Amino acid sequence: PPQFLRWIKEWGTNVCIQKQEHKEYVKSKCSNVTNLGAQASESNNCTSEIKKYQEWSRKRSIQWETISKRYKKYKRMDIL
Q: Which residue numbers in the chain precede an interruption (C–N > 2.5 Å)?
A: none
Closest residue by Cα to residue 50 from 28, 70, 65:
28
The pair phi, psi for residue 66, each rounded to 5°, is: -70, -15
Residues 27 and 25: their CA atoms lie apart, in Å, by 6
Closest residue by Cα to residue 28 from 39, 36, 19:
39
Closest residue by Cα to residue 26 from 53, 56, 59, 62:
53
Task: Report long-range pairs for 3-12 (Cβ below 8 Å, ≥24 apart).
Answer: 4/70, 4/71, 5/77, 8/77, 12/77, 12/80
The pair phi, psi for residue 2, each rounded to 5°, is: -65, 155
- DSSP 3-state of 43: coil
Residues 55 and 13: their CA atoms lie apart, in Å, by 21
